[PDB]
Design an enzyme around this catalytic site. Structure first.
Site, short mmCIF file in Angstrom:
data_model
loop_
_atom_site.label_atom_id
_atom_site.label_comp_id
_atom_site.label_asym_id
_atom_site.label_seq_id
_atom_site.Cartn_x
_atom_site.Cartn_y
_atom_site.Cartn_z
N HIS B 238 1.87 100.40 37.80
CA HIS B 238 2.31 101.41 38.76
C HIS B 238 1.19 102.39 39.11
CE1 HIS B 238 4.05 104.04 35.17
NE2 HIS B 238 2.79 103.68 34.97
N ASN B 239 1.12 102.75 40.40
CA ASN B 239 0.23 103.78 40.93
C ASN B 239 -1.25 103.41 40.82
OD1 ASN B 239 2.84 105.45 39.78
ND2 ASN B 239 2.12 106.00 41.84
#
Ligand SMILES: CC1(C)CC(=O)c2c(nc3nn(-c4ccccc4)c(O)c3c2-c2ccccc2Cl)C1
Ligand SMILES: CC1(C)CC(=O)c2c(nc3nn(-c4ccccc4)c(O)c3c2-c2ccccc2Cl)C1
Ligand SMILES: CC1(C)CC(=O)c2c(nc3nn(-c4ccccc4)c(O)c3c2-c2ccccc2Cl)C1
Ligand SMILES: [Mg+2]
Ligand SMILES: [Mg+2]
Lengths: 339, 337, 335
Positions: B238-239
């Protein structure tokens, strides 16, 4: 399923000691076995424990027999006999039975006898499935691919196009055979896709674990030999060739154009670079970092194992500065040499 | 699709030397090539071998041309020309053609022109598929996700909800885009799930290999730049942000909130720590253990490679005890001085 | 949508500012706009709170003097963020209702409020608990049981005889219950050992995408309650993982490993088998775990990145470290 102990003994080529009329329903571990189960002993330290095992029969050696407290099947090799009897008594279901109405099968696909295709599997044009092939639910088998007699795919396996799989293979769920190899030319930083128009050729009696990927070749083929076993989460890049009977444990990554010989054993989480060859009868222990060809059989290893973190911080700092340590050592040697 | 050699030469901007009416049916390696095949020479050591090649034509340089023993296509860059002619002569099928009666397509999905969707694929509400998009058999495309014109998914690809994919992308089978990031808070030893309500944004002309996972962001988004190529079995947490034209080879594992610049090259089986940045034009060689930010372009490496097991046992034991070796070296220095 | 006063009550937070503010969602501090609640854990953000455009900020008591908006004061902003994100969650469900293209064996048992997505395949003998949701394209094999509240995203594979507890969540591409890697060897030929154990997964387990958890050979692979497992992990046959342990992405575990409770296994670690790791062990990323771990604490391995020019020298010297050792010994003898 159920089998008389005498019949099981004859199929195992075992010496029966005890009641051949006992009915064996399944295999179990020594700890879990109950009435109707057969189990096995490979470790003689459990001889004193056999009176605690409630199996109806125990596979053991001749040296174990005086210690039995049950019907015994005496064999030379209890572990191999266990494998065989577990196949005879296997409770694993088939991935599919008959042809699911929800399967989508191209009219040009050719089926042999006794083929099974599970629910919602998709079979492309030109596919050939040999006798007794089983395709699990949700699989995809791409154009013109050929799957040899007795081979079986569990659910949600993806076979791309122009793939050849031999006889009596087994492929676990989530695996992808025949995706594009990682081939690109470079036009000023722009990656230019090189179509991957080779294939994957998989021999007979190959077993492949779950979520493993085996890419097709760029022009010529990726080749997996007969009798090879591959575990879960492995990556076999384009134009890799793996020789007969080699074993690859879980999470191994192999780069393009690697050639691995026969009877090799690749430990879990190893990283094997490409455009090189590993000869027959090589063992790479787990997490091995293989950067150079291997031209002699034997066992090879890499990696610095775990330490308490405070210790590791010092280890890593000293190793990273090892060139300074080398220079100090040489300087000291010169002084001791009176130069 | 068969093509005349002169027509192929024209599309490749190559100088034809030989019979333009030769019909080319396909590309082949130099050793495999037979009549009707075109092949290419990048290594001048094969000049003496060209008379052993049965291709109908060979792509080569002007310096190679005196050594030709066949019709020749002369170019500045034979490898690039090979890529282009393999595209022209590509035999790879499409993942699907037309819209399968067994596909399940929400009434609110918006299909562009000439979209193909394979058998048993599943398209959620609000999905938008641009012109010429092809969805392979067995795929799942989640709510409100958007896939740009010309992008293609092979069979059994999973796209979650609120994902944006650009134009002319290609995603291989088994890949999952938009699963929850690994976000949990800890409450007295118990893990408390943090919903991952960011997205994944994939740019144009991105290629993603098989069984790769790209998680959605926690709040803001996971972002894959244009022109990125990602191999099989990669984990993009994620991210993570990956800059344009970066290449990520097979088996790379990236932790959350890693930012990688443009034109990086991450070698296979590398492991990259999170909450940090790698600048543009960084190369990490295979199995690199990237623990700290990289602020300067260049090539970086880690790892102690294979040795015979007997040798390794001593190497590992000595390294683990290197503090003691260091102390002895210092003691010997003091004694000598 | 929720009134700030109500949200604060549900979070056990002390409200400072207008309780009638309507909160519509959670956003990062940099992205937050009117209607969003956000949070801060790092005090570096105090100086520029005047630039945050959230309607409310979850913070500590010490942060409160720097507030430039309505604030919810709590002891633990990150945990409060997790809770408020669940209240405000926008994630959709994998499926709603029973899809007519799903293929469901007549002997499967479904509880109340079960949803089954398009083209999912449910085998004979399966039991699905109340509120279970099976995503599109999943496969659930014979006699497997999935307990109430558990959810599978699309294209998850569950083999036969698997047991999954309550309130679990499994992401797409994951395979639970494939054969363990078990073979005997007959003169160089591998002889398959059928893997007739199972996988037992506890309650509140979360499993990431394209993770594989193999069934046991005879007895079972066991995942404890509250375990979280990230993407691309391999859990081999007869591994046992204790409650509340976390396993980050790309970890590979070998057969018959036992991991205790409250462990933390860092990403891309490699954990060998037939051994035990006690409770409360942390292994940092890429850890090469070859030996049992008998004391709690943090453990690490690996020689990290250097510039390539430097690495070439480091690696060559380490590979020849036995010669360095002998030379140091010889020098000690001469001195
Ligand atoms: C095939 C077999 C019946 C026999 C075998 O040798 C084997 C097996 N499982 C294995 N798991 N991991 C493993 C190690 C770390 C993480 C995950 C898995 C091996 O490294 C295995 C190995 C093995 C060990 C050392 C070198 C080469 C190999 Cl193939 C099971
Ligand atoms: C994209 C390309 C056309 C060019 C390229 O650089 C490349 C390619 N294949 C590669 N396989 N493995 C690889 C190595 C070990 C295991 C598995 C795969 C690389 O590390 C590759 C790399 C590469 C090498 C070093 C650093 C960064 C990268 Cl991307 C093919
Ligand atoms: C579970 C949690 C909420 C908390 C946590 O500690 C954690 C998390 N994600 C993590 N990704 N990678 C990771 C590292 C490299 C590549 C890919 C992933 C960790 O190593 C994480 C770790 C972690 C860090 C140190 C030691 C052990 C762990 Cl499990 C998120
Ligand atoms: Mg269907
Ligand atoms: Mg790995």
């Amino acid at each position: 399923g159920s089998i008389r102990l005498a019949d099981l003994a004859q199929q195992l080529d075992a010496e029966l000691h005890g009641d051949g009329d006992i009915v064996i329903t399944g295999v179990a571990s020594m700890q879990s076995a109950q009435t109707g189960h057969i189990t096995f002993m490979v470790n003689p330290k459990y001889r004193e424990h056999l009176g605690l095992c409630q199996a109806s029969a125990v596979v053991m050696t001749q040296d174990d027999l005086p210690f039995a407290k049950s019907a015994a099947l005496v064999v030379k090799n209890p572990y191999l006999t266990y494998a065989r009897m577990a196949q005879i008594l296997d409770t694993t279901p088939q991935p599919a039975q008959n042809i699911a109405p929800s399967a989508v099968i191209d009219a040009t696909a050719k089926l042999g006898n006794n083929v099974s295709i599970g629910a919602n599997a998709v079979i492309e044009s030109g596919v050939e499935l040999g006798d007794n092939v089983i395709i699990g639910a949700g699989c995809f088998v791409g154009k013109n691919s050929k799957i040899g007699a007795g081979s079986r795919l569990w659910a949600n396996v993806t076979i791309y196009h122009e793939i050849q799989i031999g006889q009596n293979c087994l492929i676990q769920s989530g695996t992808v055979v025949g995706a594009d190899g990682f081939g690109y030319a470079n036009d000023r930083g722009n990656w230019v896709k090189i179509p991957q128009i080779g294939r994957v050729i998989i021999g007979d009696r190959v077993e492949i674990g779950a979520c493993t990927t085996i890419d097709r070749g760029a022009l010529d083929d990726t080749i997996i030999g007969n009798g090879v076993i591959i575990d879960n989460q492995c990556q076999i890049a384009h134009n890799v060739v793996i020789g007969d009977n080699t074993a690859v444990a879980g999470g191994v990554i192999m780069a393009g154009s690697l050639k691995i010989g026969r009877y090799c054993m690749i430990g879990g989480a190893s990283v094997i670079n490409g455009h090189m060859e590993i000869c027959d009868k090589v063992t790479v222990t787990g997490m091995g970092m293989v950067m150079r060809p291997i031209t002699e059989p034997g066992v090879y290893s890499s990696g610095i194992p775990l330490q308490p973190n405070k210790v590791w911080r010092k280890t890593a700092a000293l190793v990273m500065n090892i060139d300074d340590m080398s220079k100090r050592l040489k300087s000291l040697e010169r002084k001791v040499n009176q130069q």
